[PDB]
Design a protein around this nucleic acid. Structure first.
Ligand SMILES: *C(=O)[C@H](CCSC)NC=O
Ligand SMILES: [Mg+2]
Ligand SMILES: [Mg+2]
Ligand SMILES: [Mg+2]
Ligand SMILES: [Mg+2]
Ligand SMILES: [Mg+2]
Ligand SMILES: [Mg+2]
Ligand SMILES: [Mg+2]
Ligand SMILES: [Mg+2]
Ligand SMILES: [Mg+2]
Ligand SMILES: [Mg+2]
Ligand SMILES: [Mg+2]
Ligand SMILES: [Mg+2]
Ligand SMILES: [Mg+2]
Ligand SMILES: [Mg+2]
Ligand SMILES: [Mg+2]
Ligand SMILES: [Mg+2]
Ligand SMILES: [Mg+2]
Ligand SMILES: [Mg+2]
Ligand SMILES: [Mg+2]
Ligand SMILES: [Mg+2]
Ligand SMILES: [Mg+2]
Ligand SMILES: [Mg+2]
Ligand SMILES: [Mg+2]
Ligand SMILES: [Mg+2]
Ligand SMILES: [Mg+2]
Ligand SMILES: [Mg+2]
Ligand SMILES: [Mg+2]
Ligand SMILES: [Mg+2]
Ligand SMILES: [Mg+2]
Ligand SMILES: [Mg+2]
Ligand SMILES: [Mg+2]
Ligand SMILES: [Mg+2]
Ligand SMILES: [Mg+2]
Ligand SMILES: [Mg+2]
Ligand SMILES: [Mg+2]
Ligand SMILES: [Mg+2]
Ligand SMILES: [Mg+2]
Ligand SMILES: [Mg+2]
Ligand SMILES: [Mg+2]
Ligand SMILES: [Mg+2]
Ligand SMILES: [Mg+2]
Ligand SMILES: [Mg+2]
Ligand SMILES: [Mg+2]
Ligand SMILES: [Mg+2]
Ligand SMILES: [Mg+2]
Ligand SMILES: [Mg+2]
Ligand SMILES: [Mg+2]
Ligand SMILES: [Mg+2]
Ligand SMILES: [Mg+2]
Ligand SMILES: [Mg+2]
Ligand SMILES: [Mg+2]
Ligand SMILES: [Mg+2]
Ligand SMILES: [Mg+2]
Ligand SMILES: [Mg+2]
Ligand SMILES: [Mg+2]
Ligand SMILES: [Mg+2]
Ligand SMILES: [Mg+2]
Ligand SMILES: [Mg+2]
Ligand SMILES: [Mg+2]
Ligand SMILES: [Mg+2]
Ligand SMILES: [Mg+2]
Ligand SMILES: [Mg+2]
Ligand SMILES: [Mg+2]
Ligand SMILES: [Mg+2]
Ligand SMILES: [Mg+2]
Ligand SMILES: [Mg+2]
Ligand SMILES: [Mg+2]
Ligand SMILES: [Mg+2]
Ligand SMILES: [Mg+2]
Ligand SMILES: [Mg+2]
Ligand SMILES: [Mg+2]
Ligand SMILES: [Mg+2]
Ligand SMILES: [Mg+2]
Ligand SMILES: [Mg+2]
Ligand SMILES: [Mg+2]
Ligand SMILES: [Mg+2]
Ligand SMILES: [Mg+2]
Ligand SMILES: [Mg+2]
Ligand SMILES: [Mg+2]
Ligand SMILES: [Mg+2]
Ligand SMILES: [Mg+2]
Ligand SMILES: [Mg+2]
Ligand SMILES: [Mg+2]
Ligand SMILES: [Mg+2]
Ligand SMILES: [Mg+2]
Ligand SMILES: [Mg+2]
Ligand SMILES: [Mg+2]
Ligand SMILES: [Mg+2]
Ligand SMILES: [Mg+2]
Ligand SMILES: [Mg+2]
Ligand SMILES: [Mg+2]
Ligand SMILES: [Mg+2]
Ligand SMILES: [Mg+2]
Ligand SMILES: [Mg+2]
Ligand SMILES: [Mg+2]
Ligand SMILES: [Mg+2]
Ligand SMILES: [Mg+2]
Ligand SMILES: [Mg+2]
Ligand SMILES: [Mg+2]
Ligand SMILES: [Mg+2]
Ligand SMILES: [Mg+2]
Ligand SMILES: [Mg+2]
Ligand SMILES: [Mg+2]
Ligand SMILES: [Mg+2]
Ligand SMILES: [Mg+2]
Ligand SMILES: [Mg+2]
Ligand SMILES: [Mg+2]
Ligand SMILES: [Mg+2]
Ligand SMILES: [Mg+2]
Ligand SMILES: [Mg+2]
Ligand SMILES: [Mg+2]
Ligand SMILES: [Mg+2]
Ligand SMILES: [Mg+2]
Ligand SMILES: [Mg+2]
Ligand SMILES: [Mg+2]
Ligand SMILES: [Mg+2]
Ligand SMILES: [Mg+2]
Ligand SMILES: [Mg+2]
Ligand SMILES: [Mg+2]
Ligand SMILES: [Mg+2]
Ligand SMILES: [Mg+2]
Ligand SMILES: [Mg+2]
Ligand SMILES: [Mg+2]
Ligand SMILES: [Mg+2]
Ligand SMILES: [Mg+2]
Ligand SMILES: [Mg+2]
Ligand SMILES: [Mg+2]
Ligand SMILES: [Mg+2]
Ligand SMILES: [Mg+2]
Ligand SMILES: [Mg+2]
Ligand SMILES: [Mg+2]
Ligand SMILES: [Mg+2]
Ligand SMILES: [Mg+2]
Ligand SMILES: [Mg+2]
Ligand SMILES: [Mg+2]
Ligand SMILES: [Mg+2]
Ligand SMILES: [Mg+2]
Ligand SMILES: [Mg+2]
Ligand SMILES: [Mg+2]
Ligand SMILES: [Mg+2]
Ligand SMILES: [Mg+2]
Ligand SMILES: [Mg+2]
Ligand SMILES: [Mg+2]
Ligand SMILES: [Mg+2]
Ligand SMILES: [Mg+2]
Ligand SMILES: [Mg+2]
Ligand SMILES: [Mg+2]
Ligand SMILES: [Mg+2]
Ligand SMILES: [Mg+2]
Ligand SMILES: [Mg+2]
Ligand SMILES: [Mg+2]
Ligand SMILES: [Mg+2]
Ligand SMILES: [Mg+2]
Ligand SMILES: [Mg+2]
Ligand SMILES: [Mg+2]
Ligand SMILES: [Mg+2]
Ligand SMILES: [Mg+2]
Ligand SMILES: [Mg+2]
Ligand SMILES: [Mg+2]
Ligand SMILES: [Mg+2]
Ligand SMILES: [Mg+2]
Ligand SMILES: [Mg+2]
Ligand SMILES: [Mg+2]
Ligand SMILES: [Mg+2]
Ligand SMILES: [Mg+2]
Ligand SMILES: [Mg+2]
Ligand SMILES: [Mg+2]
Ligand SMILES: [Mg+2]
Ligand SMILES: [Mg+2]
Ligand SMILES: [Mg+2]
Ligand SMILES: [Mg+2]
Ligand SMILES: [Mg+2]
Ligand SMILES: [Mg+2]
Ligand SMILES: [Mg+2]
Ligand SMILES: [Mg+2]
Ligand SMILES: [Mg+2]
Ligand SMILES: [Mg+2]
Ligand SMILES: [Mg+2]
Ligand SMILES: [Mg+2]
Ligand SMILES: [Mg+2]
Ligand SMILES: [Mg+2]
Ligand SMILES: [Mg+2]
Ligand SMILES: [Mg+2]
Ligand SMILES: [Mg+2]
Ligand SMILES: [Mg+2]
Ligand SMILES: [Mg+2]
Ligand SMILES: [Mg+2]
Ligand SMILES: [Mg+2]
Ligand SMILES: [Mg+2]
Ligand SMILES: [Mg+2]
Ligand SMILES: [Mg+2]
Ligand SMILES: [Mg+2]
Ligand SMILES: [Mg+2]
Ligand SMILES: [Mg+2]
Ligand SMILES: [Mg+2]
Ligand SMILES: [Mg+2]
Ligand SMILES: [Mg+2]
Ligand SMILES: [Mg+2]
Ligand SMILES: [Mg+2]
Ligand SMILES: [Mg+2]
Ligand SMILES: [Mg+2]
Ligand SMILES: [Mg+2]
Ligand SMILES: [Mg+2]
Ligand SMILES: [Mg+2]
Ligand SMILES: [Mg+2]
Ligand SMILES: [Mg+2]
Ligand SMILES: [Mg+2]
Ligand SMILES: [Mg+2]
Ligand SMILES: [Mg+2]
Ligand SMILES: [Mg+2]
Ligand SMILES: [Mg+2]
Ligand SMILES: [Mg+2]
Ligand SMILES: [Mg+2]
Ligand SMILES: [Mg+2]
Ligand SMILES: [Mg+2]
Ligand SMILES: [Mg+2]
Ligand SMILES: [Mg+2]
Ligand SMILES: [Mg+2]
Ligand SMILES: [Mg+2]
Ligand SMILES: [Mg+2]
Ligand SMILES: [Mg+2]
Ligand SMILES: [Mg+2]
Ligand SMILES: [Mg+2]
Ligand SMILES: [Mg+2]
Ligand SMILES: [Mg+2]
Ligand SMILES: [Mg+2]
Ligand SMILES: [Mg+2]
Ligand SMILES: [Mg+2]
Ligand SMILES: [Mg+2]
Ligand SMILES: [Mg+2]
Ligand SMILES: [Mg+2]
Ligand SMILES: [Mg+2]
Ligand SMILES: [Mg+2]
Ligand SMILES: [Mg+2]
Ligand SMILES: [Mg+2]
Ligand SMILES: [Mg+2]
Ligand SMILES: [Mg+2]
Ligand SMILES: [Mg+2]
Ligand SMILES: [Mg+2]
Ligand SMILES: [Mg+2]
Ligand SMILES: [Mg+2]
Ligand SMILES: [Mg+2]
Ligand SMILES: [Mg+2]
Ligand SMILES: [Mg+2]
Ligand SMILES: [Mg+2]
Ligand SMILES: [Mg+2]
Ligand SMILES: [Mg+2]
Ligand SMILES: [Mg+2]
Ligand SMILES: [Mg+2]
Ligand SMILES: [Mg+2]
Ligand SMILES: [Mg+2]
Ligand SMILES: [Mg+2]
Ligand SMILES: [Mg+2]
Ligand SMILES: [Mg+2]
Ligand SMILES: [Mg+2]
Ligand SMILES: [Mg+2]
Ligand SMILES: [Mg+2]
Ligand SMILES: [Mg+2]
Ligand SMILES: [Mg+2]
Ligand SMILES: [Mg+2]
Ligand SMILES: [Mg+2]
Lengths: 275, 48
RNA sequence: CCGAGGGUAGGGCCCGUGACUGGGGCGAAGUCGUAACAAGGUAGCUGUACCGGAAGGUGCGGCUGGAU
RNA sequence: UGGGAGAGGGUGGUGGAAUUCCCGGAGUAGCGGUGAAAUGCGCAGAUACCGGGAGGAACGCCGAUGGCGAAGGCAGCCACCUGGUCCACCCGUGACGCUGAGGCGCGAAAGCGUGGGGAGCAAACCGGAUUAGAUACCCGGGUAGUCCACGCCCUAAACG
RNA sequence: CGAUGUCGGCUCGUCGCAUCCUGGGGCUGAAGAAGGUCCCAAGGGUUGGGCUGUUCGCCCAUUAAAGCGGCACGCGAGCUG
RNA sequence: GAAUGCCGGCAUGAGUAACGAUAAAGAGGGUGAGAAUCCCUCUCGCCGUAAGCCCAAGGGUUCCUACGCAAUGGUCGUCAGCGUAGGGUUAGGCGGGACCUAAGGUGAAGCCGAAAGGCGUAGCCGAAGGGCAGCCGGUUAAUAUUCCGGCCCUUCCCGCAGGUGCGAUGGGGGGACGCUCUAGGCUAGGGGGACCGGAGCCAUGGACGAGCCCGGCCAGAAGCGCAGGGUGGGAGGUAGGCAAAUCCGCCUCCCAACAAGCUCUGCGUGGUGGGGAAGCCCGGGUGACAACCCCCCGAAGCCAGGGAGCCAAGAAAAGCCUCUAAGCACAACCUGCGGGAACCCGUACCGCAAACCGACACAGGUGGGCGGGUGCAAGAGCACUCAGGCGCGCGGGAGAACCCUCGCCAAGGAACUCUGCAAGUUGGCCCCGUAACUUCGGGAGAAGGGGUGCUCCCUGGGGUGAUGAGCCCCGGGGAGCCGCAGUGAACAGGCUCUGGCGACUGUUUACCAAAAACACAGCUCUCUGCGAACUCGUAAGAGGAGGUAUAGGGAGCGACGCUUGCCCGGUGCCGGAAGGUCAAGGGGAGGGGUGCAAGCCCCGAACCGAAGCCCCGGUGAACGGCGGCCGUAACUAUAACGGUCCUAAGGUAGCGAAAUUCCUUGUCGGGUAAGUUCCGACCUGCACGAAAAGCGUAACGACCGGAGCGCUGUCUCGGCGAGGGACCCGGUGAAAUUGAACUGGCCGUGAAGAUGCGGCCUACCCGUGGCAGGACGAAAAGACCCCGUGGAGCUUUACUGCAGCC
RNA sequence: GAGCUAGCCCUGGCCAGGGUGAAGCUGGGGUGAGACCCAGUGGAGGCCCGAACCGGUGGGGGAUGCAAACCCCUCGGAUGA
């Protein structure tokens, strides 16, 4: 339920902010945070390898449990729901009856005080994690492992989900958030429900400084540069592309497919994405 | 206005100093050449 | 002190007028088509919407003030 | 107080028929379409047939000259929440009524905003016909939209 | 071309006369007044504005008249730009 | 003898420019061979959120003292940051190290690369971050939290006493955190005092006064007081914190809770130790048994790890505390006390500058802290002033032009000019009041106006205190006084109307462009299923991202509103298991060389044989493209209408002489006395047009047009005045340039613009202040232009390669 | 060679004073309940004015400079990209 502002500056006209309603606890678990080393988009050579990064707010990385089969059969209580700056989803603090504490991605509808559990027998309930093979067909699911024991890989951004479409041998058929149909192995774990904070996409940043807070530095168009910089550079006056639209490194950028041809996982993609 | 030379003792020793030169093939050739030329200083002076 | 009034500045309403522009009424015998009246030759009308030299056409839903 | 009939409204679920697309099988020389045709589709294997799958929308028979609502309007089936209404008994209140300028709310379709959805249909638009023309009627395509959620618009042959 | 700064303006003049005005004349299709045309004449004079970078030109209000050309399209070791 | 040759020497310009902020000087006395320039005194001026003081960096003896003045100092010099010599820097507590970790660097394990080398977990290094024990005064020519004095404190070793399951690089707690706003109580700092202490003072008309002037504190252990921070206690279970655990985490129960208690800081007090002014006399001495007290203001600092709100969600590690493990419980650890032990390096001086960076004693540049008082609404603004520091290392005259910076101006008031360029005007605060339009915020300080000092009288509310007085803060009313003028000085918007462009705040060509350019939220297309795509790298490895389609890359467009039409024949991209073409390779019909021969050797047709291309389709917010001629209406004109040629399709809405219109100052209308610009229209748009977006749009702009009001030295049209220069005298004393020169005008001539040639004219020799017409004056081997089988950046369906990808 | 400059990383520091007055909260009004209105409180913002600080808009001076980019007046930002 994104929050609007009254137009008392030019920027507040359009700025929207998340409502932070579900959030119940406003400082993180000290034993579960570590420093998140900012890169600026520089690699170990010191070279920029991802342009226009840097200068964002300081952040702490919250260690997330993307396995959950770590603690089969051990129930936990949902102790708190918290803001995580490192991802779009909110996070849930779990107090296991073990005493062990862990963060998971907070699915939609998860309530503080309820109990979650992981394992092949867990009830089909929002927040529980089971291997895919034991989840009934049609179940909306999130935080899906892509190979057994390798960690939750798919459907983690705010609002996303995968839907279980059918089974075939050792594999289940998922409709990913992109609409691709894919075979994922049945022993791969997944969590019942959709990721929460589904309004995240309707946030209007509102001003250029807001992008700067997130570490987004200004993006400069190819058509704004010179020929030494960019295929679109140069020209007297403004200029149209004057060639097929291209990246700074010269490859075409309107249509040109880029997935590797002979990639082994092609045997597991049923149908490519949609819309 | 601000000129180009803004002296800094730690910067000087860590950039042109004897130990920076020794750690690198080109820095050792600098030392080898300044010794062969007979320089009284192989490396810039800084107080430290 | 108040004070006719004069001056300065800014508002409100009305009237007249204006390059040009909008459609309206009217005018014995102009040009284009033929939308409506018969099932008017695609039943018509309709609110809306999009489109077309023009009447109009088509979509969606509605009315019989429609015929057989 | 005790009863009743009903597509009255809202929420959540859920069933089968059909269309379209996808995969597998089998099969070959046309299919489609019209007044007649052509565009279109088809040996790169279509149409017609069988099995599998996905998805949206609408609910056949019952169904009526029927029922419900103040109107707009409401039709598979199930559950919950909720309105109106009629009948019987003749128990309670004791004229507490009628209407109603303003006000407030509801208000088909189309249209608008922000998300989503998209099978079929289909403004615009393209093509094939017809024609003197044919910015039409007919034919093959096809985008909004038609569907959902919230928020707008407030119109009508909103008619008995 | 081992460099002669290039438009216009401003400032400062100076010269030519094929004379705009003023002075002197002949002819007139010169009644007067006012013109037209040509001859002599360079002493002095030849305004202030609107527009445009403008030169030029058109317009306003005047005037005896609001002349035309040269001086490296006079003048940037004088200014402007 | 020439190479704008090379090196050196020495000329010319020339006793010329200049002598480095216009804060400013005068005199007396001293010293000395010599004095505007050194020392001393008095007077004057300048800074005072500094031009004063303290740190850090950087510099490296410049510090202090004696003796010097050749050179250095823009003059002088007896002076000096200069020459010579001697002296000077004292730490367990300040800073760094024997402590921690941050980016990053390095790197046993390991990975990679022809070599050199590149990576890389832990570990190690790495600080202005964490952590950790000293305050006040005195002393030197020169150091001082360092020496000394007083009062405090830290760690290490050993010992005594008492207590305890002691013990760690291992587990846990803590350390430990943002931005804005902010409470209570304090301190720093400051204002006042009719109170306390003080050398004196009474002038010039008056005052011996509740007069003037000066000062009225600082540090302090335990204890106590005030104000705060931190913190639940008990028990049972326990499978989690990579062994163990009595610790920690989780569940339960009992008790305690806006507390209290324990604990830790800040402030006050505090044994005690210090300090102590004017004035006067010669840095000192006196004052002085100095006094050291009350009231007010009051932090941005302290209590602090305080409170609240918000989104963009805010280091690590050690110290420290707790738990246990081997081990050891004769040990070991905790608490108290005692004695001993306590190392290395820095410390002088400059430090907004004459000692640092700028070749200079250079008007530039340089991070942190303190930065007093009065008034002006506030304040670090402005004016003046304290403490303290300076008068800027050439002066003395004169009172021309001209230049700079500044002041004023009759009448006019933009007539100036490309342009109101520049300079006026306006200017703070309080009150009254305020338009179109709007996205309802704004536009707005709209505009426009009134008030503003001083005196007396009455009165309201708050803070401190006590509810009162005093001090202090915000006021309300009445009556008066003076001047030309009351934000009386200084600091402090001119305003409006209307267009173009860009939504907006931002960014940019360091050093000629700040803009309409870039960016920007936002819109769309496209790629990417995760060992993602993409990027850097030979690779390993990285970034992407410890992210996962509500995410990430690429591209265009550029808030928002209303919208974004037709063309897929060419190019691109996407789809298409057929067909055609197609390399190595497979195959081997059929040949050939050689040998006596077995054989050896070579060529080789059909046929099979990938991507790519061809071919079949799709696709525009992919590259792009969106017609011509002729005729036609009952006045004319013009064509709603028709004919025909061509195309892949013939530009729709909206806009239009435009930041686009050539003809052009198009035509008409507005504004003006007059308008090539401006605004509104028209449309035969040379040559607009829909995300290289189309048309609008409130607000915004040191952007660019046009107009009006206000006001002006911009101008008619100039005048006067000030100061710094220019000028003269003393001191010091450059420069580019320069073939040599005994270097005039005209009319000619001459390589076509002559001081230098011809003819004539004119002219005694040499300077000084001025002006710029010439010396085709100086400067820089023309940037334009061409030429060279010269160079370089850029492009592409030029050629040929290569990475990369298939 | 990144001691100048450009970007990023780690860790610190700085931004006088005044003005405007968002949401929220409270109360009052309102209604079937609401929306909503009013007042108070509150203190938001690439908000406003203006020093430090960061800039470099217009003009003038300078032009063998005080300076190989400076000086004067004026002007932009100043809680934020
Ligand atoms: C012509 O005007 C020329 C241009 C020099 S700068 C391009 N000027 C002198 O030649
Ligand atoms: Mg908003
Ligand atoms: Mg609003
Ligand atoms: Mg939330
Ligand atoms: Mg930690
Ligand atoms: Mg990293
Ligand atoms: Mg690295
Ligand atoms: Mg490196
Ligand atoms: Mg990149
Ligand atoms: Mg980057
Ligand atoms: Mg993310
Ligand atoms: Mg979150
Ligand atoms: Mg799998
Ligand atoms: Mg979004
Ligand atoms: Mg961020
Ligand atoms: Mg951009
Ligand atoms: Mg460009
Ligand atoms: Mg460019
Ligand atoms: Mg480059
Ligand atoms: Mg290139
Ligand atoms: Mg290129
Ligand atoms: Mg280009
Ligand atoms: Mg360009
Ligand atoms: Mg162009
Ligand atoms: Mg360009
Ligand atoms: Mg381009
Ligand atoms: Mg092009
Ligand atoms: Mg290209
Ligand atoms: Mg896909
Ligand atoms: Mg600089
Ligand atoms: Mg530096
Ligand atoms: Mg250093
Ligand atoms: Mg350093
Ligand atoms: Mg350094
Ligand atoms: Mg180095
Ligand atoms: Mg070194
Ligand atoms: Mg080597
Ligand atoms: Mg070498
Ligand atoms: Mg040397
Ligand atoms: Mg030696
Ligand atoms: Mg060296
Ligand atoms: Mg009809
Ligand atoms: Mg008809
Ligand atoms: Mg009909
Ligand atoms: Mg008909
Ligand atoms: Mg149609
Ligand atoms: Mg066929
Ligand atoms: Mg076949
Ligand atoms: Mg579907
Ligand atoms: Mg009864
Ligand atoms: Mg309706
Ligand atoms: Mg057709
Ligand atoms: Mg025909
Ligand atoms: Mg559709
Ligand atoms: Mg009816
Ligand atoms: Mg030349
Ligand atoms: Mg020369
Ligand atoms: Mg020249
Ligand atoms: Mg020259
Ligand atoms: Mg003039
Ligand atoms: Mg006559
Ligand atoms: Mg004359
Ligand atoms: Mg004359
Ligand atoms: Mg002119
Ligand atoms: Mg000319
Ligand atoms: Mg002209
Ligand atoms: Mg006359
Ligand atoms: Mg002339
Ligand atoms: Mg000429
Ligand atoms: Mg010419
Ligand atoms: Mg000229
Ligand atoms: Mg000239
Ligand atoms: Mg000049
Ligand atoms: Mg000129
Ligand atoms: Mg000259
Ligand atoms: Mg000259
Ligand atoms: Mg110019
Ligand atoms: Mg010779
Ligand atoms: Mg020379
Ligand atoms: Mg030479
Ligand atoms: Mg020579
Ligand atoms: Mg030489
Ligand atoms: Mg010599
Ligand atoms: Mg020489
Ligand atoms: Mg010499
Ligand atoms: Mg001389
Ligand atoms: Mg001279
Ligand atoms: Mg000079
Ligand atoms: Mg000088
Ligand atoms: Mg000065
Ligand atoms: Mg004197
Ligand atoms: Mg003197
Ligand atoms: Mg002297
Ligand atoms: Mg002397
Ligand atoms: Mg002296
Ligand atoms: Mg002061
Ligand atoms: Mg030095
Ligand atoms: Mg000397
Ligand atoms: Mg001397
Ligand atoms: Mg000597
Ligand atoms: Mg000297
Ligand atoms: Mg000097
Ligand atoms: Mg002497
Ligand atoms: Mg010393
Ligand atoms: Mg000590
Ligand atoms: Mg030791
Ligand atoms: Mg370490
Ligand atoms: Mg290191
Ligand atoms: Mg270290
Ligand atoms: Mg440190
Ligand atoms: Mg210390
Ligand atoms: Mg102490
Ligand atoms: Mg001594
Ligand atoms: Mg103990
Ligand atoms: Mg913490
Ligand atoms: Mg933390
Ligand atoms: Mg920290
Ligand atoms: Mg905040
Ligand atoms: Mg104190
Ligand atoms: Mg005070
Ligand atoms: Mg007396
Ligand atoms: Mg346990
Ligand atoms: Mg403390
Ligand atoms: Mg004393
Ligand atoms: Mg005494
Ligand atoms: Mg502060
Ligand atoms: Mg604190
Ligand atoms: Mg706090
Ligand atoms: Mg760390
Ligand atoms: Mg024992
Ligand atoms: Mg040692
Ligand atoms: Mg010292
Ligand atoms: Mg100092
Ligand atoms: Mg400075
Ligand atoms: Mg400083
Ligand atoms: Mg100083
Ligand atoms: Mg010096
Ligand atoms: Mg000094
Ligand atoms: Mg000096
Ligand atoms: Mg200096
Ligand atoms: Mg004081
Ligand atoms: Mg003030
Ligand atoms: Mg002076
Ligand atoms: Mg000075
Ligand atoms: Mg001086
Ligand atoms: Mg003088
Ligand atoms: Mg004189
Ligand atoms: Mg001055
Ligand atoms: Mg004056
Ligand atoms: Mg006067
Ligand atoms: Mg005047
Ligand atoms: Mg005027
Ligand atoms: Mg006037
Ligand atoms: Mg004017
Ligand atoms: Mg101009
Ligand atoms: Mg003023
Ligand atoms: Mg108005
Ligand atoms: Mg208004
Ligand atoms: Mg207006
Ligand atoms: Mg407007
Ligand atoms: Mg409004
Ligand atoms: Mg005003
Ligand atoms: Mg008054
Ligand atoms: Mg007075
Ligand atoms: Mg102002
Ligand atoms: Mg214009
Ligand atoms: Mg802008
Ligand atoms: Mg711009
Ligand atoms: Mg625009
Ligand atoms: Mg806009
Ligand atoms: Mg924009
Ligand atoms: Mg700003
Ligand atoms: Mg520039
Ligand atoms: Mg430049
Ligand atoms: Mg430069
Ligand atoms: Mg400039
Ligand atoms: Mg520019
Ligand atoms: Mg600007
Ligand atoms: Mg730019
Ligand atoms: Mg923008
Ligand atoms: Mg947009
Ligand atoms: Mg989108
Ligand atoms: Mg690469
Ligand atoms: Mg290699
Ligand atoms: Mg990573
Ligand atoms: Mg842009
Ligand atoms: Mg609008
Ligand atoms: Mg095409
Ligand atoms: Mg095509
Ligand atoms: Mg194509
Ligand atoms: Mg092939
Ligand atoms: Mg084309
Ligand atoms: Mg083209
Ligand atoms: Mg259209
Ligand atoms: Mg036009
Ligand atoms: Mg015109
Ligand atoms: Mg236009
Ligand atoms: Mg054009
Ligand atoms: Mg034109
Ligand atoms: Mg023109
Ligand atoms: Mg005209
Ligand atoms: Mg007119
Ligand atoms: Mg025309
Ligand atoms: Mg384009
Ligand atoms: Mg263009
Ligand atoms: Mg426009
Ligand atoms: Mg606008
Ligand atoms: Mg702007
Ligand atoms: Mg601007
Ligand atoms: Mg004007
Ligand atoms: Mg003047
Ligand atoms: Mg003077
Ligand atoms: Mg002399
Ligand atoms: Mg000298
Ligand atoms: Mg000679
Ligand atoms: Mg001679
Ligand atoms: Mg001579
Ligand atoms: Mg002569
Ligand atoms: Mg000639
Ligand atoms: Mg001659
Ligand atoms: Mg001569
Ligand atoms: Mg001769
Ligand atoms: Mg001769
Ligand atoms: Mg001669
Ligand atoms: Mg002669
Ligand atoms: Mg003569
Ligand atoms: Mg002289
Ligand atoms: Mg002279
Ligand atoms: Mg001359
Ligand atoms: Mg000259
Ligand atoms: Mg001169
Ligand atoms: Mg000359
Ligand atoms: Mg010459
Ligand atoms: Mg000349
Ligand atoms: Mg040369
Ligand atoms: Mg040349
Ligand atoms: Mg040259
Ligand atoms: Mg040149
Ligand atoms: Mg040429
Ligand atoms: Mg050639
Ligand atoms: Mg040649
Ligand atoms: Mg060449
Ligand atoms: Mg080349
Ligand atoms: Mg690629
Ligand atoms: Mg640097
Ligand atoms: Mg600030
Ligand atoms: Mg403040
Ligand atoms: Mg105000
Ligand atoms: Mg308020
Ligand atoms: Mg609140
Ligand atoms: Mg601001
Ligand atoms: Mg203001
Ligand atoms: Mg600057
Ligand atoms: Mg400047
Ligand atoms: Mg100015
Ligand atoms: Mg000059
Ligand atoms: Mg210069
Ligand atoms: Mg300056
Ligand atoms: Mg100034
Ligand atoms: Mg400001
Ligand atoms: Mg501020
Ligand atoms: Mg920031």
């Amino acid at each position: 339920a994104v929050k609007k502002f009254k137009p008392y500056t030019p920027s507040r006209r359009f700025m929207t902010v998340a409502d932070f309603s579900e959030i119940t606890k406003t400082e993180p678990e000290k034993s579960l945070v570590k420093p998140l080393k900012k890169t600026g988009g520089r690699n170990n050579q010191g070279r920029i390898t991802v342009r226009f990064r840097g200068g964002g707010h300081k952040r702490l990385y919250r260690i997330i449990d993307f396995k959950r089969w770590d603690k089969v059969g051990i129930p936990a209580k949902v102790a708190a729901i918290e803001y995580d700056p490192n991802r779009s989803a909110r996070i849930a603090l779990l107090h296991y009856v073990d005493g062990e504490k862990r963060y998971i991605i907070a699915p939609d509808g998860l309530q503080v005080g309820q109990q979650v559990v992981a394992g092949p027998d867990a009830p089909i309930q929002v927040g529980n994690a089971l291997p895919l093979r034991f989840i009934p067909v049609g179940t909306v699911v999130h935080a899906v492992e892509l190979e057994p024991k390798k960690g939750a890989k798919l459907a983690r951004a705010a609002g996303t989900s995968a839907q279980i479409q059918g089974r075939e041998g050792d594999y289940v058929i998922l409709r990913l958030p992109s609409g691709e149909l894919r075979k994922v192995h049945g022993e791969c774990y997944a969590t019942v429900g959709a990721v929460g904070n589904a309004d995240h996409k309707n946030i209007v940043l509102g001003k250029a400084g807001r992008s700067r807070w997130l570490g987004r530095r200004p993006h400069v168009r190819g058509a704004a540069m010179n020929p030494v910089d960019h295929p679109h550079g140069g020209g007297e006056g403004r200029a149209p592309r004057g060639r097929p639209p291209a990246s700074p490194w010269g490859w075409q950028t309107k249509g040109l497919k880029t997935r590797k041809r002979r990639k082994p996982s092609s045997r597991f993609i049923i149908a490519r994405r949609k819309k | 206005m601000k000129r180009t030379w803004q002296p800094n003792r730690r910067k000087r020793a860590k950039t042109h100093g004897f130990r920076a030169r020794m750690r690198t093939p080109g820095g050792r050739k600098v030392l080898k050449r300044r010794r062969q030329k007979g320089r009284w200083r192989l490396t810039p002076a800084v107080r430290k």
